[PDB]
Design a protein around this ligand. Structure first.
Ligand SMILES: OC[C@H]1O[C@H](OC[C@H]2O[C@H](O)[C@@H](O)[C@@H](O[C@H]3O[C@H](CO)[C@@H](O)[C@H](O)[C@@H]3O)[C@@H]2O)[C@@H](O)[C@@H](O)[C@@H]1O
Ligand SMILES: OC[C@H]1O[C@H](OC[C@H]2O[C@H](O)[C@@H](O)[C@@H](O[C@H]3O[C@H](CO)[C@@H](O)[C@H](O)[C@@H]3O)[C@@H]2O)[C@@H](O)[C@@H](O)[C@@H]1O
Lengths: 109, 109
């Protein structure tokens, strides 16, 4: 497992049970009610998936797709942003946008 | 600027930091870009004054002196787009890109 950073979600990492990303006043929350909610910006954002499943979780895969699965691995919501195989990161930026970047093209080690 | 990431079009100014726990990335006054506790540096000490770290629209990290002359570059490049250089909690600086998805809480969409 990868250590957690408040404003980041790397490929393989999971959020659930009100686990969240935070930056300034912005929060991106995988709520217990299966709704993925961004509290911040001007209007906020939601996946609009309240009660669509039980014990749902958020996971960014290694193709850059961000998915909400329920306890039985039924797809609840997807970013539908599948791209090249590699390492990705979801950043809840200081400016309120939550953006998926990848694959990783360069590293120090 | 975010505390642990740099976006394409943004600048990490002289004596500026990117930090994630014990790993502290500094664009120093002596032009050396040093990842403290991460056993990595650009190895450009005394190569210029008022040096700045930028990230191109091709995902290349660039160190330029005060006059805008290129002192160092990461060499790895990809397609024109929006990139993000992230200080991973395990102590690597990683360039991810291009962006494949964005949540916009500033516009109802
Ligand atoms: O500003 C963000 C967003 O807020 C509104 O949508 C999010 C709400 O959607 C559902 O009503 C719920 O998921 C709600 O979650 C709260 O209430 C739940 C029970 O009703 C509870 O289980 C949760 O823990 C939480 O308290 C969300 O808050 C809406 O205004 C959007 O337009 C807006 O973008
Ligand atoms: O422990 C990591 C690493 O440390 C050493 O590399 C980093 C140093 O590289 C150069 O010596 C300088 O860039 C130095 O920067 C400090 O000293 C400068 C001159 O006084 C000053 O201007 C800077 O502001 C800064 O204080 C870096 O600290 C080296 O021993 C590596 O082998 C070792 O891996």
């Amino acid at each position: 497992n990868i250590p957690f950073t408040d404003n980041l979600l790397f490929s393989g990492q999971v959020l659930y049970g009100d686990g969240r990303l935070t930056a300034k006043n912005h929060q991106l929350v995988m709520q217990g009610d299966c709704n993925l909610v961004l509290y911040g910006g001007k209007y906020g954002w939601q996946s609009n998936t309240h009660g669509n499943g039980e014990h749902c979780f958020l996971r960014l895969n290694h193709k850059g797709e961000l998915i909400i699965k329920d306890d039985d691995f039924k797809t609840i919501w997807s970013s539908n942003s599948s791209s090249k195989q590699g390492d990705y990161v979801l950043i809840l930026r200081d400016d309120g946008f939550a953006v998926i970047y990848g694959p990783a093209i360069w590293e120090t080690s | 600027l975010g505390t642990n990431y740099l976006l394409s079009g943004q600048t990490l100014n002289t004596d500026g930091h990117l930090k994630n726990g014990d790993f502290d990335l500094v664009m120093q006054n002596d032009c050396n870009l040093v990842l403290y506790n991460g056993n990595w540096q650009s190895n450009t000490a005394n190569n210029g004054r008022d040096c700045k770290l930028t990230l191109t629209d091709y995902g290349e990290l660039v160190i330029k002196n005060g006059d805008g002359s290129t002192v160092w570059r990461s060499r790895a490049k990809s397609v024109k787009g929006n990139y993000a250089a992230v200080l991973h909690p395990d102590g690597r600086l990683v360039v991810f890109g291009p962006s494949v998805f964005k949540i916009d809480p500033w516009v109802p969409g």
